[PDB]
Design a protein around this ligand. Structure first.
Ligand code: MNH
Ligand SMILES: CC(C)C1=CC2=CC[C@@H]3[C@](C)(CCC[C@@]3(C)C(=O)N[C@@H](Cc3c[nH]c4ccccc34)C(=O)O)[C@H]2CC1
Length: 453
């Protein structure tokens, strides 16, 4: 049949609909109006936005569809290169890096990172214990300090020392400005008016800053023979069991840059949304706080204790349901195929999965999809295949999922053990869109339960 399409702007087709500060939220409203699938046309390109589990369960069939690099990922590839996130599945360096790194990101590998994660989580708790009575917490700012420092220390034994600064690390200044330039180029019609030579100049300088610190990190480690159990040691020593080859130093740099992007606001967003929903749902906060107090009986949490924070895990899954912090991914058709018995696609045709809309499919979740209810995840096995996809799909799924959830469960556990929280401004959710999503200006007050560390 005829696929629905949103409003057009003459020869510009649908392109101006993404000339907005909040394109994901705009696409969600278009999905609300048009339903499970809509065509999006621009001069020279056509994609289809999927919102229903019924169609997304077919999109997630790896025999029929593979990961596409969206324009967003193609612009990020200028500095993330052939790292896992910005590689095609058919690139030799994708399969090598995947085989070498995947065992180092397992639930079981988190035992080795736990001590380092505790180091940064304790720095967060001590910061909040040390605030004066009249002061508040800038939640996304503090969560980003935690997640960046955690990936720096577990990733390559580097301390960003985010709790010791207002001003970002020079690497982060360049990474954030490079990510901004990549996202800004999406809505940039003609990028060659002489105003955009200065953007392009700044872009090349930020790439050089990122390449220089990371190449130096790798070079320093190769020299010292120092064997830290971090991802960088794993990458310098590891061999792909298929090819028998290791990663080269350039590819290792791209992997580190990719991990630092991922571990920044994409991961801290989960913690910012989780705390937002907890302060807006005080009975849910109380239930999560009762679990944290019952389970976290030692001054520092153990790996086994974090694994026993079941309700805190449910809280984080329910935050990922409503506001997944990497809210879309792109696929292409491996062969001519028919989607949902109705939508014929040619080989190469592109799909975009709109994850926030998938997570609001009433046929899966029931009518009250806007409610924050962690009890939806009492038994995560009960969720049908391809209904809950905040970490993407199949062999191209998030490699960091167990790392992100261990980090988030540990620190949210400790926060709920150590503090009562107040929504002292009655904060109005305002979701800022970058490469990720965050509750912009989210602030709370934390009152110590005066429990020692
Ligand atoms: C919450 C936190 C969080 C979310 C919601 C998340 C979401 C995603 C989604 C969705 C994809 C699939 C993208 C696509 O185009 O299909 C993906 C791919 C990826 N992610 Mn993770 N990601 C992390 C944290 C997250 N990632 C962390 C932390 C790391 C590493 C330290 C990480 C490293 C990756 C890598 C690497 C890939 C690419 C995997 C592959 O294609 O082989 N990540
Ligand atoms: C780096 C990772 C984390 C990201 C992945 C993304 C995937 C989908 C993106 C994204 C959410 C940013 C907003 C545009 C959107 C929804 C998209 O459809 N974009 C399509 C369609 C599109 C929009 N503008 C374009 C300009 C040219 C070509 C295509 C487009 C695309 O990027 O391809 C974006 C966030 C950043």
């Amino acid at each position: 049949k005829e696929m629905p399409q949103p409003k057009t702007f003459g020869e510009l087709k649908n392109l101006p609909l993404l000339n907005t500060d909040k394109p994901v939220q705009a696409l969600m409203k278009i999905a609300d109006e048009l339903g499970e699938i809509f065509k999006f046309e621009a001069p020279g390109r056509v994609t289809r936005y999927l919102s229903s589990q019924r169609l997304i369960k077919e999109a997630c069939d790896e025999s029929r569809f593979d990961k596409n690099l969206s324009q967003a990922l193609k612009f990020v590839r200028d500095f993330a290169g052939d790292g896992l996130f910005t590689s095609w599945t058919h690139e030799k360096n994708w399969k090598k890096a995947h085989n070498i790194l995947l065992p180092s990101f397992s639930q079981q590998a988190m035992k080795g990172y736990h001590a380092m994660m505790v180091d940064i989580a304790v720095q967060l708790v001590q910061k909040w214990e040390r605030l004066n009575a009249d002061e508040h917490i800038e939640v996304p700012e503090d969560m980003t300090r935690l997640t960046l420092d955690t990936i720096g220390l577990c990733g390559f034994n580097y301390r960003f020392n985010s709790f010791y600064r207002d001003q970002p690390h020079p690497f982060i200044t360049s990474m954030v400005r490079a990510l901004d330039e990549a996202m800004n180029k999406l809505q940039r019609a003609n990028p060659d008016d002489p105003a955009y030579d200065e953007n392009k100049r700044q872009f090349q300088e930020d790439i050089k800053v990122m390449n220089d610190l990371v190449d130096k990190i790798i070079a320093d480690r190769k020299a010292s023979g120092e064997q830290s159990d971090d991802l960088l040691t794993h990458m310098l020593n590891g061999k792909d069991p298929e090819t028998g080859e290791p990663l080269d130093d350039e590819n290792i740099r791209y992997q580190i840059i990719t991990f630092l992007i991922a571990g920044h606001e994409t991961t801290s967003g989960l913690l910012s949304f989780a705390l937002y929903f907890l302060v807006k749902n005080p009975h849910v906060l109380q239930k999560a706080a009762e679990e944290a107090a019952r389970v976290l009986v030692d001054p520092v949490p153990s790996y086994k204790q974090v694994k026993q924070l079941k309700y805190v895990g449910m809280v984080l899954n329910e935050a990922l349901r409503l506001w997944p912090t990497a809210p879309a991914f792109s696929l292409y058709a491996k062969e001519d195929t028919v989607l949902g018995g109705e939508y014929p696609l040619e080989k190469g045709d592109e799909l975009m999965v709109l994850i926030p809309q998938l997570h609001r499919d009433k046929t899966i979740w029931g009518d009250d999809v806007e409610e924050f209810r962690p009890e939806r995840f009492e038994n995560p096995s009960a969720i049908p295949q391809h209904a809950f996809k905040p970490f993407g799909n199949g062999q191209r799924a998030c490699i960091g999922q167990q790392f992100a959830l261990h980090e988030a469960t540990l620190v949210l556990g400790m926060m709920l053990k150590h503090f009562d929280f107040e929504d002292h401004t009655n904060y109005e959710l305002d979701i800022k869109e970058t490469l990720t999503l965050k509750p912009e200006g989210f602030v709370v007050k934390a009152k110590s339960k005066k429990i020692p560390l």
